[PDB]
mmCIF file of C-alpha atoms in Angstrom:
data_model
loop_
_atom_site.group_PDB
_atom_site.id
_atom_site.type_symbol
_atom_site.label_atom_id
_atom_site.label_comp_id
_atom_site.label_asym_id
_atom_site.label_seq_id
_atom_site.Cartn_x
_atom_site.Cartn_y
_atom_site.Cartn_z
ATOM 1 C CA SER A 208 9.284 -0.615 -8.742
ATOM 2 C CA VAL A 209 6.432 -1.528 -6.367
ATOM 3 C CA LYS A 210 7.846 -4.132 -3.988
ATOM 4 C CA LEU A 211 5.732 -7.265 -3.433
ATOM 5 C CA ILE A 212 5.518 -8.318 0.226
ATOM 6 C CA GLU A 213 4.816 -12.021 0.847
ATOM 7 C CA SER A 214 5.616 -12.407 4.555
ATOM 8 C CA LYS A 215 5.420 -10.682 7.909
ATOM 9 C CA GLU A 216 9.223 -10.609 8.016
ATOM 10 C CA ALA A 217 9.501 -9.020 4.559
ATOM 11 C CA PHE A 218 6.978 -6.342 5.650
ATOM 12 C CA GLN A 219 9.027 -5.559 8.767
ATOM 13 C CA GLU A 220 12.238 -5.433 6.701
ATOM 14 C CA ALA A 221 10.618 -3.079 4.190
ATOM 15 C CA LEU A 222 9.404 -0.774 6.951
ATOM 16 C CA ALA A 223 12.925 -0.688 8.380
ATOM 17 C CA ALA A 224 14.486 -0.155 4.939
ATOM 18 C CA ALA A 225 12.199 2.894 4.373
ATOM 19 C CA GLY A 226 13.740 4.868 7.241
ATOM 20 C CA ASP A 227 11.774 8.091 7.650
ATOM 21 C CA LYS A 228 9.991 7.873 4.273
ATOM 22 C CA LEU A 229 6.248 7.487 3.855
ATOM 23 C CA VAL A 230 5.438 3.883 3.000
ATOM 24 C CA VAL A 231 2.192 3.229 1.081
ATOM 25 C CA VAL A 232 0.911 -0.358 0.927
ATOM 26 C CA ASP A 233 -1.633 -1.531 -1.613
ATOM 27 C CA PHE A 234 -3.523 -4.542 -0.278
ATOM 28 C CA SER A 235 -5.013 -6.173 -3.381
ATOM 29 C CA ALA A 236 -6.375 -9.298 -5.027
ATOM 30 C CA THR A 237 -5.916 -10.128 -8.695
ATOM 31 C CA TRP A 238 -9.556 -11.115 -9.081
ATOM 32 C CA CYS A 239 -10.884 -7.883 -7.588
ATOM 33 C CA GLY A 240 -11.988 -5.437 -10.274
ATOM 34 C CA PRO A 241 -11.108 -2.114 -8.568
ATOM 35 C CA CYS A 242 -7.684 -3.516 -7.715
ATOM 36 C CA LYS A 243 -6.957 -4.341 -11.359
ATOM 37 C CA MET A 244 -8.238 -0.892 -12.287
ATOM 38 C CA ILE A 245 -5.969 1.092 -9.958
ATOM 39 C CA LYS A 246 -2.813 -1.076 -10.354
ATOM 40 C CA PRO A 247 -1.256 0.895 -13.281
ATOM 41 C CA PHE A 248 -1.930 4.199 -11.479
ATOM 42 C CA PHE A 249 -0.363 2.823 -8.280
ATOM 43 C CA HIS A 250 2.743 1.694 -10.234
ATOM 44 C CA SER A 251 2.897 5.162 -11.891
ATOM 45 C CA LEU A 252 3.129 6.880 -8.461
ATOM 46 C CA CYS A 253 6.922 6.612 -8.107
ATOM 47 C CA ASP A 254 7.189 9.142 -10.955
ATOM 48 C CA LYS A 255 5.058 11.649 -9.024
ATOM 49 C CA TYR A 256 6.282 10.967 -5.488
ATOM 50 C CA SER A 257 9.955 10.213 -5.578
ATOM 51 C CA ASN A 258 10.528 10.019 -1.784
ATOM 52 C CA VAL A 259 7.679 7.590 -1.022
ATOM 53 C CA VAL A 260 8.107 3.801 -0.779
ATOM 54 C CA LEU A 261 5.415 1.712 -2.518
ATOM 55 C CA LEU A 262 4.618 -1.796 -1.382
ATOM 56 C CA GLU A 263 2.037 -4.316 -2.534
ATOM 57 C CA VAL A 264 0.459 -7.192 -0.603
ATOM 58 C CA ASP A 265 -1.569 -9.733 -2.582
ATOM 59 C CA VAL A 266 -4.017 -10.875 0.047
ATOM 60 C CA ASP A 267 -4.365 -14.304 -1.607
ATOM 61 C CA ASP A 268 -0.588 -14.962 -1.506
ATOM 62 C CA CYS A 269 -0.234 -13.679 2.062
ATOM 63 C CA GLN A 270 -3.410 -14.356 4.107
ATOM 64 C CA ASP A 271 -1.608 -14.057 7.473
ATOM 65 C CA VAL A 272 -0.293 -10.607 6.677
ATOM 66 C CA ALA A 273 -3.782 -9.570 5.461
ATOM 67 C CA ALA A 274 -5.259 -10.772 8.772
ATOM 68 C CA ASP A 275 -2.706 -8.871 10.840
ATOM 69 C CA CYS A 276 -3.391 -5.620 8.955
ATOM 70 C CA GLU A 277 -7.196 -5.682 9.467
ATOM 71 C CA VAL A 278 -8.050 -5.305 5.762
ATOM 72 C CA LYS A 279 -11.697 -5.761 4.748
ATOM 73 C CA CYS A 280 -12.042 -3.994 1.383
ATOM 74 C CA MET A 281 -9.833 -3.929 -1.643
ATOM 75 C CA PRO A 282 -7.842 -2.173 -2.756
ATOM 76 C CA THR A 283 -6.891 -0.938 0.703
ATOM 77 C CA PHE A 284 -4.121 1.664 0.938
ATOM 78 C CA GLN A 285 -2.304 1.809 4.284
ATOM 79 C CA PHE A 286 0.141 4.550 5.156
ATOM 80 C CA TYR A 287 3.119 3.890 7.447
ATOM 81 C CA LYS A 288 5.721 6.143 8.999
ATOM 82 C CA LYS A 289 8.622 4.841 11.077
ATOM 83 C CA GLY A 290 7.080 1.426 11.256
ATOM 84 C CA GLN A 291 3.601 2.510 12.396
ATOM 85 C CA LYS A 292 0.294 2.768 10.511
ATOM 86 C CA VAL A 293 -0.734 6.443 10.398
ATOM 87 C CA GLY A 294 -3.622 6.282 7.900
ATOM 88 C CA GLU A 295 -5.734 4.088 5.652
ATOM 89 C CA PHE A 296 -8.510 4.145 3.165
ATOM 90 C CA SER A 297 -10.041 1.722 0.730
ATOM 91 C CA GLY A 298 -11.262 2.100 -2.812
ATOM 92 C CA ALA A 299 -9.866 2.712 -6.257
ATOM 93 C CA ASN A 300 -9.789 6.519 -5.846
ATOM 94 C CA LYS A 301 -6.934 8.234 -7.699
ATOM 95 C CA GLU A 302 -7.635 11.670 -6.211
ATOM 96 C CA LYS A 303 -7.789 10.430 -2.610
ATOM 97 C CA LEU A 304 -4.599 8.435 -3.086
ATOM 98 C CA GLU A 305 -2.682 11.544 -4.254
ATOM 99 C CA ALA A 306 -4.143 13.770 -1.572
ATOM 100 C CA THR A 307 -3.417 11.222 1.178
ATOM 101 C CA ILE A 308 0.181 10.726 0.041
ATOM 102 C CA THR A 309 0.628 14.498 -0.015
ATOM 103 C CA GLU A 310 -0.831 14.805 3.499
ATOM 104 C CA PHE A 311 1.687 12.341 4.973
ATOM 105 C CA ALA A 312 4.772 12.445 2.777
#
């Protein structure tokens, strides 16, 4: 299950709960076409990548988190290891998402 993050504190808790695992965060908006497009693929990822943690931030529900994370396009995928951001890209690109996960997992 992709865990929804609705506060700065929940984000910090999720990063701590991940330990050493790659954490991938989908920053999305329900009105944004490419976000809706990629959402089922993003949920399907736990079947492919069983030691990666998947989080979701809805930028409308959590504007202060969005601001802190310097998002400007959606969907934006941010990659975290041991509590730090180690990569990012934006766009509904299945191939790039898989390749980026593989590069950091």
